[PDB]
Amino acid sequence: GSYGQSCCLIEDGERCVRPAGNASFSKRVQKSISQKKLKLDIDKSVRHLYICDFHKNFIQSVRNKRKRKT
Numbered sequence: 001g002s003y004g005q006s007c008c009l010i011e012d013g014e015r016c017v018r019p020a021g022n023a024s025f026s027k028r029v030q031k032s033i034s035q036k037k038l039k040l041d042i043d044k045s046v047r048h049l050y051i052c053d054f055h056k057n058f059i060q061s062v063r064n065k066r067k068r069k070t
């Protein structure tokens with residue numbers, strides 16, 4: 001209904017519909033995306049700050065490295 005524990009992100013125009021958990025979109029997350037110029041916009045329709053755990057890892061991936069570990 002108006003309530004819906006799902007994401008608030010948009011990627012390339014696909015309004016993310018993955019289920020939302022403990023993950024959210026604080027004013028600190030923004031700067032990590034701005035410094036990376038990703039296609040990750042914000043759904044103002046539900047006017048909420050929840051994200052799916054798939055997107056939670058994505059913004060945490062840009063702080064890591066594509067080089068694997070032992």
Ligand SMILES: [Zn+2]
Binds near residue numbers: 008009017018
């Ligand atoms: Zn998402």
